[PDB]
């Protein structure tokens, strides 16, 4: 029951520590959700993982998806997101 394991683990595994088993369960549940074509539920799982990774200070600890767009400026000809 990796679904219940992941949905319980995201309540404070990367917020307080870091173990490989929780990341394995999270990736396995995300792959299963992709395989069932539950992309909306995968997105809800991702935003819940982002929301529950807020520390006491406020620094996010979730391994979020990296940026895919780096627009080049028309005038200065440099990266707008550095």
């Amino acid at each position: 029951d990796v679904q219940s394991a992941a949905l319980i683990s995201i309540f404070g595994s990367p917020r307080y520590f870091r173990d490989q088993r929780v990341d394995e369960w999270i990736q396995t549940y995300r792959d299963m959700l992709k395989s069932w074509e539950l992309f909306s539920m995968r997105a809800r799982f991702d935003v819940l993982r982002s929301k529950l990774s807020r520390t006491k200070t406020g620094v996010l600890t979730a391994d979020i998806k990296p940026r895919q767009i780096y627009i080049q400026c028309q005038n200065c000809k440099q990266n707008i997101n550095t």
């Binding site: 909306s40 995968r42 997105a43 935003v47 996010l60 998806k65 940026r67 895919q68 780096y70 080049q72």
Partner: protein, 134 residues
């Protein structure tokens, strides 16, 4: 053209401007809707000169110009990036995108419209705290 722009007829203005025999009607900078991207893994600019040159040579040899449809800016020739994926469905994305602004994530029209209208969700569907609502 300015009179057409004064009314809400922009597609007609685009049709008029696309096939105008005069080449310097609106602006002289050339391409002002052209967007250049840096790569998400190496940081170099996605210009793809090698792929365009090879596909131009191949299409010159084989005659048909459908080989040049394989050229695109969804891959990087320096870092050998395979494809850019949709933020919701994780499928290859080649022809039309819908970029979420504050976080810089891709999307099909149907996928992004589904997540931001049908599901009534105000967050980015890729795990982003910045509320890019509607």
């Amino acid at each position: 053209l300015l009179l057409l722009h004064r009314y809400e007829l922009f597609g007609i203005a685009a049709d008029v401007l696309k096939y105008c025999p005069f080449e310097d009607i609106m602006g002289s900078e050339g391409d002002q809707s052209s967007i250049r991207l840096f790569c998400e893994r190496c940081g170099e600019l996605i210009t793809n000169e090698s792929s365009k040159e090879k596909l131009r040579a191949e299409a010159q040899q084989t005659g048909n110009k459908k080989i040049m449809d394989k050229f695109g800016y969804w891959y990087c020739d320096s870092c050998k990036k395979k494809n850019t994926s949709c933020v919701l469905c994780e499928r290859p994305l080649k022809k039309l995108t819908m970029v979420i602004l504050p976080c810089g994530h891709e999307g099909h029209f149907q996928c992004i419209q589904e997540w931001f209208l049908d599901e009534n969700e105000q967050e980015c569907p890729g795990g982003c705290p910045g509320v890019a609502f509607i």
